Amino acid sequence: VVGAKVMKDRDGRPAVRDPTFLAETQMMKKDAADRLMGETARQSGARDTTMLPNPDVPVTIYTEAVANKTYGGVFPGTTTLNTAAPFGKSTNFSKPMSDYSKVVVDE
């Protein structure tokens, strides 16, 4: 039996832990708290993330944004048709008029 941090209170009563308050008052990080109490924190705050189709791409904050299609809105950037390399700079709108690759779909 692994020992918990705060097992029982002064009375003989088991302790149900509040992970949200911990995540608020930074007594532990939220990324750690959810994994450590995956049962309550999923009921308390947490839900699963959307994954990219290709697992070779690293999974980071911006990759999760571009996965669940909130990339351009939440994060200042440009959405890309490709998904293997999402953060490729695309400047179709800002390209000068006489550029050799410039379409006028937006204008």
């Binding site: 290709n54 299609k69 909130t70 490709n82 293997a84 379409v103 779909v105």
Partner: protein
């Protein structure tokens, strides 16, 4: 190695001696026996020295250049793969390389792109992609005749319905930043367009399917940007950066107008 994915690496392609291929064609079933019985009975344990000796005994033959060619080709083949470089990874790979005269054989090449009279088909990482000529280039599609008049009046209802189809609560604008508008499937988009514009001719509908199937992201099944798809369909133009090797000349040199 032959079962590897096969990449576009440039080749060396020594010129082969003339009477060599027709003699290897009937000699190699014996050279495979010789190399194996010299290597101890199992494949993938043949040294290039043992292979050269088995070749020299199986084909007595072997004028100077005809032997030097085999020796040089075997040397290149053994260095192809990073590692120990003490044995041969694949005897069939070596045989094919010796027949073709190319360090990397014809069998390890790419799949290519089929170009029937109108269409252009590319087998890609995720499925196949197709482009139909006589009605498009890479950048500009040929808009149907009576479509824009009917689309520009009921333009916005199309997306209102397209989001309602995928579950957008149109009262609050929270869902747009939530990202439900981001994910829209192609048949759902065309069904919303049908429900908005009524009867959609097969030609105009195919135009819509083509443009949406372009704008959809690779991998996932849903489009990237709906309000951008709006101006896309309106303008009849696409941000495709159509590439070079075999599609770019075939569009603009061939006569696809009539």
């Amino acid at each position: 190695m032959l079962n590897v994915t096969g990449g576009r690496r440039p080749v060396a392609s020594w010129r082969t001696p003339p009477g060599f291929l027709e003699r290897l064609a009937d000699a190699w079933p014996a050279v495979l026996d010789g190399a194996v019985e010299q290597a101890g009975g199992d494949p993938a344990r043949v040294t290039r020295d043992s292979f050269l000796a088995a070749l020299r005994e199986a084909l007595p033959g072997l004028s100077a250049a005809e032997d030097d060619y085999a020796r040089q080709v075997s040397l290149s083949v053994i260095q192809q793969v990073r590692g120990s470089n003490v044995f041969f990874p694949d005897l069939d790979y070596l045989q094919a390389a010796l027949l073709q005269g190319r360090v990397p054989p014809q069998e390890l090449d790419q799949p290519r792109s089929t170009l029937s009279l109108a269409t252009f088909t590319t087998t890609t990482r995720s499925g196949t992609k197709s482009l139909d000529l006589f009605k498009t280039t890479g950048v500009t599609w040929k808009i149907p005749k009576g479509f824009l008049n009917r689309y520009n009046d009921c333009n916005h209802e199309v997306l209102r319905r397209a989001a309602a189809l995928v579950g957008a609560r149109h009262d609050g604008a929270r869902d747009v930043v939530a990202g439900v508008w981001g994910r829209v499937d192609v048949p759902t988009f065309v069904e919303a367009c049908r429900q908005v514009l009524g009867e959609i001719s097969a030609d105009e509908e195919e135009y819509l399917i083509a443009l949406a199937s372009e704008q959809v992201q690779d991998g996932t099944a849903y489009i990237r940007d709906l309000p951008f798809l709006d101006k896309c369909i309106q303008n009849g133009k696409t941000p495709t950066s159509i590439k070079g090797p075999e599609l770019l000349p075939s569009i603009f040199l061939n006569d696809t107008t009539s």
